[PDB]
Design brief:
It contains 12 helices and 5 strands. It has 246 residues and is an alpha/beta fold. Bound molecules: adenosine-3'-5'-diphosphate. This is Nad dependent epimerase/dehydratase.
Length: 246
């Protein structure tokens, strides 16, 4: 098996639902940040090294391609950070893979981002996210990798991540650049709520019969997950409250 679909959409654009939709279509695994968190935390340092490699005056592109290939072995698709930030590299490695750009209203996106992936540095809720994630074994190394992958997607070394106005403009620019770089016939822009129809047409498959398009990972559910991790201190003890997520 090899990469068939490259998900270029940013975090909080429906990437977990797209991951699930691609797993339904292909009956093979799709990579996502949740693969790292819930199945393979040893991947954190590997991603960090690949991102660090991009910051060298002379980066080793073959080291990056080889590292991506090893990370994605056994997967049919990629979505979410950190992989989305490498969509150009993945297009080169997998010239026959199609590209998906999941997208949504930028104000809704920013709101969701601040609730889940990138709270402002002095937002009290950041401390709660961190306390809940500690239950999962997630610590500062994960947050560094996540933030560095977002900065790499936005092509900025120094950026004030606490400035909403900057993030909104980075979002629009990132999505504009995907549409500029990817040949139209190789790209599907999938707006939140678009469902199976356009996706299945683009991938040359029928709409899965009787299977609805996935709809999980809302910020409401993430807030509940953080709170229940804090309260019970065990993922196993609470996972029955969160079907269809991990
Ligand atoms: N089928 C669907 N229809 C509408 N929104 C969806 C959806 N699947 C996921 N989403 C939204 O996509 C966001 C999650 O994205 P990701 O999986 O990339 O982190 C959440 O936004 P909200 O946080 O605004 O609820 C979630 O509600």
């Amino acid at each position: 098996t090899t990469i068939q679909v490259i998900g270029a959409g940013l975090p909080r654009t429906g990437t977990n639902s797209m991951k699930k939709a691609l797993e339904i279509i292909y009956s093979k695994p799709c990579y996502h940040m949740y693969e790292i968190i819930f199945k393979k935390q040893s991947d954190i340092s590997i991603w960090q090294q690949l991102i660090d490699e991009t910051h060298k005056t002379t980066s080793d592109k073959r080291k990056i391609y080889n590292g991506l290939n090893e990370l994605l072995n056994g997967y049919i698709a990629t979505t979410d950070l950190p992989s989305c930030s490498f969509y150009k590299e993945l297009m080169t490695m997998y010239p026959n893979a199609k590209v998906l750009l999941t997208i949504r209203d930028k104000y809704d996106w920013l709101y969701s981002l601040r609730k889940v992936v990138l709270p402002k540095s002095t937002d009290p809720w950041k401390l709660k996210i961190e306390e809940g994630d500690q239950v999962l074994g997630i610590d500062s190394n994960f947050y560094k990798m996540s933030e560095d992958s977002l900065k790499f997607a936005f092509q900025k070394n120094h950026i004030n991540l606490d400035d909403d106005e900057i993030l909104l403009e980075c979002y629009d620019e990132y999505n504009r650049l995907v549409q500029e770089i990817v040949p139209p016939e190789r790209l599907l822009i999938h707006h939140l709520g678009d469902g199976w129809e356009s996706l299945c047409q683009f991938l040359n498959v029928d709409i899965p019969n009787g299977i609805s398009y996935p709809c999980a990972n809302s910020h409401h559910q993430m807030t509940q997950l953080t709170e229940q991790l804090i309260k019970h201190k065990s993922l196993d003890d609470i996972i029955h409250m969160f079907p269809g997520l991990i």
